[model samples]
Target: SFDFMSYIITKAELVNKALDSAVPLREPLKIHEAMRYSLLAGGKRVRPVLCIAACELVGGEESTAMPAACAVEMIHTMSLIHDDLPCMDNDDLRRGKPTNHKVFGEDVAVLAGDALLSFAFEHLASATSSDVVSPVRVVRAVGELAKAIGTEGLVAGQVVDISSEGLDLNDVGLEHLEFIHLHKTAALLEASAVLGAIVGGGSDDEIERLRKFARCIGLLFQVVDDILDVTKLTYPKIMGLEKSREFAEKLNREARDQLLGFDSDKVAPLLALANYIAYRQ
Candidate 1:
């Protein structure tokens, strides 16, 4: 099955290279730089690599998936930039660096995120290059990216999060938090996988299988994050760390089993990813 951990962790280098050069121009380099900073400030780079790997699973090259991987990372970075803003999570530091606004000023940070998001579409079009059938795959992937970070995804989660302040999960609603983290975090993770599967020319059935797998990971990812934010109600905070961890484990197993028919090392990286997440501190 290969060293699953090694594959994804190592793949970050390639994805980061793309992220660094993602900007199309040097004029507003700082804005673009800020986007790159937020992007590559170096967390796991898990989502982007997952996209590339999913593409590989479908017999596509990393090059075929690069644009989509970078674009999804941009969207994820934008969500992080906003989430860490003073008006949002109000965090001063992220990934051991000053938040985007702190480094580039609020207006610049805002513009940077907007720029990255818009540019993601530009990247998506390229992913659709040489359409064998239709541009529908591109359209769906783009839509998935939007839903992941927009009102249906991260944005919606933020609204619920802001409203849930002070109240614990038991004292509040679970679905509210479910939707929050699902969209806020898991959506992009899920979209990254789906986009990769699609852009790499996965068959419809393959796409559906990966979509379900990603969705499972999406919620599982949220549950793990919630477990991490025990003091602040991340996910497991509402579900209880034990329950969250247990659910995450179940999802990992299910995710592993999802592709019972696919027999490639590519699936190894993603399944190992799910397994690795459960133990992440």
Candidate 2:
């Protein structure tokens, strides 16, 4: 327990420090504040931590993975900002604070999200040291990161979600649900792991295995979220919490199996992460 706690706290401090120095309050102070506020708002920092963990799993140094980790978090924060906009979920609260649009007007909130999204790729490409991380690896990460947010990934799921709203609950099958979650939620997480692996110089098989590992835990995350939210139309709604918990257990098993090929000592963080997701309150 101490080891996992120490791992999380250590990585979180690194992430928070990088994030603090990332977007300074500049000429456009408001926009920068908006970006920094949401970005710094405390959460688990799961995606970035996962990226670092995967990179370390493949013998990559933490420093080598830091840029991509920050980039992944940037993408995630941008998505959250957009998701909370008036045009989308339109939420007023996020992480126990006023949502981006609530603090900054809708126009500024939208632009901030766009700015963060674009800057994520820019940060990945420009901030990473070519001397440490090869250009080829950085380019590969850029491609994966872009794909995760593009049409085939998060965008595809959001489109379907928008269209499927208010549809008869009985009509939504397990397959349709999986399709939405796979793209909407799992895509970014998959990209996080894949980017880490590719940047860490993992082989093709290793990359694919980590991708699947991330996928399973990613879906499990949403399942746990739905259970906690008690949303009317989610995995728990359709499958029941008992079944959902069982499903999460299955996912945890699969995710763990993916790391069996690697040294067990090297993957302690990842294995703990999977269990944490399953049993977290």
Candidate 3:
């Protein structure tokens, strides 16, 4: 049996090493330190792992996908830093450690996040070069990444979420909740899988399938998160625990169904991933 735990650990190590090398603690010491502090703060590295897994699933070498994987990780880390700022969620804790703003001060935390966001695009464009992956694919990936973080994507979700903070649950409503998360969480995940397929040379149809599959798991991820965060009145609190579990199961099945045409053994990780996202405490 393929030990999923071992597989994730190996991938996490590769991702961490690449991430460490991507941003060396060099000149502009404070900003660099702040960036590295949160960058290496050690989450699951889920986006990078998804990028690599999707690339491998479509027959690309790990080397070719490494830059894109790192790009996603950079973006993810930046989002976290910004999300925890006093202006945003204002949370004092993240990943079981002090948030970026807590340790680095708000200004450095914001600057570091900006640096990471810009660096992510630069890294993807330069690192995923003609020597590594096709130029066309790299361009496509870059475009997708841009859209995922732009006004219509993650930013839109955050804007809406912040604006709705003081409103009643009735005002926010279920549709707004869905819309917020669809952009906030699912956008990057869709890009993660789609970028992988592009670099890995999957056809348009296959890429779309993977995109849809990742979207399901991405939303499933947030749903499970809502269920876990007892402090907040999230989906579980509003929708009920049993309902949340049922919704997650529905997403999990749909995600797996999207992989029906792929090789079962090859896509086993993804299928397992859907379940993992669903059942994770």
Candidate 4:
């Protein structure tokens, strides 16, 4: 029974603040501009904030969460860059500005995407102090990140998605769509949130609960994108908006319910965030 506008405003502000900090990170001028083009541009900062909030909810230090937040943003930026590449969505606008390649050219945009991907791991590793988060742990997360973005995760999903192209719809085809979203977008979300929880000192149970929530929300987010897409929006086109919207609601509710078991004030924001994800439009 809360105003959704208020929630988004708060999250948007946090997202931009994190975004502002990320743009000036280490880089050559060309690479920096390409990365900043998207990073400075607007996008919801749900991943990073959930990360920091999840950590703080369980009494973890804010400092411990900061780098993770940035890293999550980094991975998100990478996904966006690749998603907008000439071979992918092939868009010319992002956050309402010219796409990275549209302004910076394709090669630089490619490098910018690479920069974001590799720099993500560096940020995670550099964030540690006094053994608070281990190099090995960060490395493990990095490996997962690589997989999520590479052949096994996001890229894999895109491969299937692009191949599906103009295929006919069937139950099996729909299942592949589900798998694509789950691995590509959802995998990254799951990985980012879980990484935050892990470094923030979440117990095994807490991490597992968070994993489930991320998994559900990941699908919910993509289903919403699909719904918007079919509405002839800038979102990716998809068939069966009604069914996809149903999945969004279903998974979003499951995500909220999962939070209840963990029980924290931070849980409210996360639940609200899930609600936002399913019904943001």
- List of clashing residue pairs for candidate 2: none
TM-score against native, each model: 0.87, 0.93, 0.92, 0.83
TM-score of 4: 0.83
For residues 82-185, could you state the per-residue lDDT of candidate 4 as single tens digits?
Answer: 88989888998877677888898888888888888777877777755536766666666666556667777777777777765533444435655667778777
Q: Which stretches of candidate 2 lie over 4 Å from their true place?
A: 165-172, 227-231
Candidate 1: stretches off by over 4 Å: 131-134, 164-172, 225-237
- Model 4: residues with Cα > 4 Å off, grouped in runs: 1-15, 22-27, 164-167, 225-246
Tell me which residue pairs clash in candidate 3: none
Q: Write out the backbone clash pairs for model 1.
A: 226-234, 226-235, 226-236
User: Sort by lDDT, best first: what order?
Assistant: 2, 3, 1, 4
Question: Per-residue lDDT for 1-281 in model 1, tens only?
Answer: 38765676679888877777766447657766777667767677878888888898987777888888888887877877877778776889877777889988988888888887888888777644554414777788778887777777777777877864545556375666666667666777778888888888888888778877887777776676666666555555566667667778888778877777776555777777767766678
Write down the lDDT that model 4 would get.
0.73
Clashes of 3: 0
lDDT of 3 by residue, 1-281 (tens): 97788888999999999999999999989999998998887778989999999998988888888989999989988888899988787999987788889997899989999999999999999978586577887888889999999887888888888876533374355666678888999999999999989998898988999999988998898888887775343677556478877888888889989998887777977877887778865
Q: What is the TM-score of candidate 1?
A: 0.87
Per lDDT, the best of the predicted structures is 2
Give residue 245's lDDT in candidate 4 (0 to 100).
Answer: 58
**Candidate 3 residue spans exceeding 4 A from truth:** 165-172, 227-233
